[PDB]
Design a protein around this ligand. Sequence first.
Ligand SMILES: O=C(O)CCC(=O)C(=O)O
Ligand SMILES: [Mn+2]
Length: 219
Amino acid sequence: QQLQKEEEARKVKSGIRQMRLFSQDECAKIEARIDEVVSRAEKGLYNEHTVDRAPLRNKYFFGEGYTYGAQLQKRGPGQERLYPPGDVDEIPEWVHQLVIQKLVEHRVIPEGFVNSAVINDYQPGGCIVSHVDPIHIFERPIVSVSFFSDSALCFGCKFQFKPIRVSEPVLSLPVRRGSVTVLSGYAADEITHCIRPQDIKERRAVIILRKTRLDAPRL
RNA sequence: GGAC
Ligand SMILES: O=C(O)CCC(=O)C(=O)O
Ligand SMILES: [Mn+2]
């Protein structure tokens, strides 16, 4: 039914906020700090679980990190876990001053909301498989700031492998460098979101800021 | 080049 597809896409749009908030100079300053994050990881200055490496995507966990995918035995809903307290490195002060301060000042999230800053560094062709950020781990909303290039955030995609094949998205949301994305409601809880390899044509980094639940399970 |  045209009525059915229009309703779900309407539901997904309802949970999406997106606006330009960082200028080119401000991205350049933050992107430089992101490059230093990569350098410190390759110098071994970070705790073991702070750095999660994959062929075309690295995750740098600060404040709070999580286990996902192949790191889970008997993967299923509710099987994700936080690392033990103090395991991952602290949120860097430049993340507090440059990124979170602007979000708090521009009323994107309340002050003291963020306790987890995760940086996803995508190499050209990189992706992340369709998923819902664990409801048992993270409070809503989910805030992310994009850097180094423009891309798209797709919703409701189905992944096939060998080779990687992605079905037609329910919604493709262009995310540009310096743009802030806020997910809530249906867009965050009742539909998966992903980024496709065809959307990453250059190196792209995104800083994801969240609040972990009080009852969030740890390892 | 793999979070459902
Ligand atoms: O590249 C993005 O913005 C998506 C990353 C994501 O969904 C996550 O790491 O939870
Ligand atoms: Mn996610």
